[PDB]
Amino acid sequence: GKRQFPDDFIWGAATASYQIEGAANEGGRGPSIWDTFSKTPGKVLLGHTGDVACDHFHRYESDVKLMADLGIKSYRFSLAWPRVMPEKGRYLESGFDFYKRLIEQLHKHGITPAATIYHWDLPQWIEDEGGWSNRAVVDYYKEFAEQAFKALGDDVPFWITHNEPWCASLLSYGIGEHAPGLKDWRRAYRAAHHILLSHGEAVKLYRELGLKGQIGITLNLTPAYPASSPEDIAAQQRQDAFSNRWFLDPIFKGEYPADFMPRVERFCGDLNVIQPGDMETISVPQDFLGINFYTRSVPVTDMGWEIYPDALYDLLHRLKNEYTDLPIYITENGAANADAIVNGEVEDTPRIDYVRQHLDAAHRFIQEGGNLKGYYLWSLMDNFEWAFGYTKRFGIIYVDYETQVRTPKASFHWYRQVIENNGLTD
Ligand code: NA
């Protein structure tokens, strides 16, 4: 029959600043690492950049109206650091103006803001000083977080310090797929530490300012599974440490995974990054945990990622059982689909099927006492898919980049029904 969610369950959709905003060179905005990276020959498919994107900086009013039609109770978006700290030693109070306008529209339509402080658009001038590998980044982030809390505080009840440390560190500085696109494990592990430390500083600052809302981190988690024989179980443990425990353990247990740190030191040498007090600051109590879930390791979406909703069920139980009794929010979940407009409609049935499977997994967790409080679909609209540019589409709303026309997909109409019914009804 019907799978009905809790009465107070928070239904949302999510975006990120560089991915939708455009207006990259307006209002004094300085370049981010992603401006530099996308503008570098060879780094992003077809040479796509986030100059323009969905032109959301300008079109926010109409976008919010689509959100009101959808019926989301919360909209998760990110704050553009480069609009506020565009160059070394320069602060633009006006850089938060857009967010103030956006938030007014949200409140007008009874939508709660959920603001992500850092979703990867580090100002280029900080990267020029070593970026996340430099300890001084912690103070720069603190300065930005401080101004965000002061500018928006009262109007934002739900704050996310950091989006996906694994990507901002390991994928960005170690693997080199994302800005700033370096290949240096020591640098990447230094970045991981400083991202985690900056999270903790922001939480501390939030308490000290006496704000009344909630603050937490968002982690992408990719459950690993063994193929089998003791070596396969060991392989699973290595993968799990690399993707998941490297971030979960410090946040919740105030230590890095001791099984994996020797491997890190083997390939990086001494990180020379952990200072006394750091691990305590990283493990400061949060109000909630945000998780971004897409797939597992060890049929597929348009990204070629395995569809495996059981991994989400297992993951939520793992968090409950091993890590935290805090409220969990799925801050992202979604799928790429090879979408086309036929007669002004987009029939993205595969996307519907994917979200239905994941919400069923979530519903099962809730039924078994799981403290899952909210779900945000990635994404509200098609957008700049990082290294893939505009070539991959995750939206429940189609965006023609030539015309900027928004066309709600079948998935939009389906999710609207899910929200209206507060659950699955098939
Ligand atoms: Na990144």
Q: What is the 3-state secondary structure (H, E, C) of the chain?
A: CCEECCCCCEEEEECCHHHHCCCCCCCCCCCEHHHHHHCCCCCCHHHCCCCCCCCHHHHHHHHHHHHHHHCCCEEEEECCHHHHCCCCCCCCHHHHHHHHHHHHHHHHCCCEEEEEEECCCCEHHHHCCCHHHCCCHHHHHHHHHHHHHHHHHHHCCEEEEEECHHHHHHHHHHHCCCCCCCCCHHHHHHHHHHHHHHHHHHHHHHHHCCCCCEEEEEEECCCECCCCCCHHHHHHHHHHHHHHHHHHHHHHHCCCCCCCHHHHHHHHCCCCCCCCCHHHHHCCCCCEEEEECCCCECCECCCCCECCCHHHHHHHHHHHHHHCCCCEEEEECCCCCCCCCECCECCCHHHHHHHHHHHHHHHHHHHCCCCEEEEEEECCCCCCCHHHHHHCCCCCEEECCCCCCEEECHHHHHHHHHHHHCEECC
19 alpha carbon – ligand 1 mean position (Å): 12
Task: Give the Å distance between the CA of 418 and the centre of ligand 1.
Answer: 31
Residue 171 belongs to domain spanning: 3-424
CA 154 to ligand 1 center in whole angstroms: 29
Residue 334's closest CA among 380, 399, 398? 380
Q: Cα separation of 112 and 184, whole Å?
A: 40
Which residue's structure tokens are 């801050």?
331
Looking at 21, 127, 201, 332, which residue is catalytic? 332
| Residue 239 Cα distances to 75, 254, 298, 410, angstroms | 32, 20, 9, 36
Q: Length of the chain, please? A: 426
The whole-angstrom separation of Cα 173 and Cα 228 is: 32
Of 139, 130, 126, the C-alpha closest to 30 is 126
Selection from 79, 183, 186 nearest residue 123 by Cα: 79
Please tell me the distance from the alpha carbon of residue 157 to that of residue 159, in angstroms, as a whole number: 7
State the distance between the two ends of the chain, measured CA to CA, in whole angstroms: 8
Q: How many CB atoms lie within 10 A of CB 83?
A: 27
CA–CA dist 60, 65 (Å, integer):
9
Query: Residue 346 Cα, ligand 1 centroid: separation in angstroms?
Result: 30
Peptide bond into 180 cis (omega under 30): yes
Centre of ligand 1 to C-alpha 180, Å, is 8
Taking the C-alpha atoms of residue 87 and residue 31, their distance in angstroms, rounded to an integer, is 9
**Residue among 141, 140, 66, 138 nearest 105 (CA):** 66
Cα 168 to ligand 1 centre (Å): 4
Ligand 1 centroid to residue 421 C-alpha, Å: 36
Closest CA to 138 of 45, 34, 277: 277
Closest CA to 144 of 206, 84, 204, 94: 84
Which of these, 108, 73, 106, 109, lies nearest to 416 by C-alpha position?
73
CA dist list (Å): 217 to 39, 280, 344, 378: 30, 16, 39, 17
Q: Which tokens in the block code for residue 228?
A: 């089998």
Q: Which residues pair with 345 in a beta bridge?
A: 342
Q: Distance from the CA of 124 to the center of ligand 1, in angstroms?
A: 14
Phi/psi-derived region of residue 424, left when phi > 0, alpha when psi is between -120 and 50, beta in every other case: beta
CA–CA separation, 258 vs 196, rounded Å?
17
| Count of domains observed in the chain | 1
Return all residues near 375 (Cβ < 8 A) that are at least 6 apart.
Answer: 9, 10, 11, 12, 329, 330, 333, 359, 362
The two tokens of residue 274 are 């952990």
- For position 35, which CATH number holds? 3.20.20.80
Q: Which of 127, 164, 201, 385 is catalytic?
A: 164
Q: Any catalytic annotation for residue 402?
A: no
CB 230 within 8 A of CB 236: no
Q: 241, 259 in Cβ contact below 8 A?
A: yes
The technique by which this structure was obtained is X-ray
Distance, CA of 220 to CA of 116 (rounded, Å)? 14
- Selection from 404, 392, 399 nearest residue 48 by Cα: 392
CA 395 – ligand 1 centroid, Å: 20
164 as an active site residue: the answer is yes
Experimental structure resolution, Å: 2.0
User: Rounded to an integer, what distance in angstroms lies between the CA atom of residue 178 and that of residue 121?
Assistant: 11
Residue that is written with structure tokens 């991202």 in the block: 195
Say how far apart CA 394 and CA 156 lie, in whole Å.
Answer: 26
CB 121 within 8 A of CB 80: yes
CA nearest 223: which of 309, 334, 333, 289? 309
Closest CA to 179 of 139, 220, 123, 222: 123
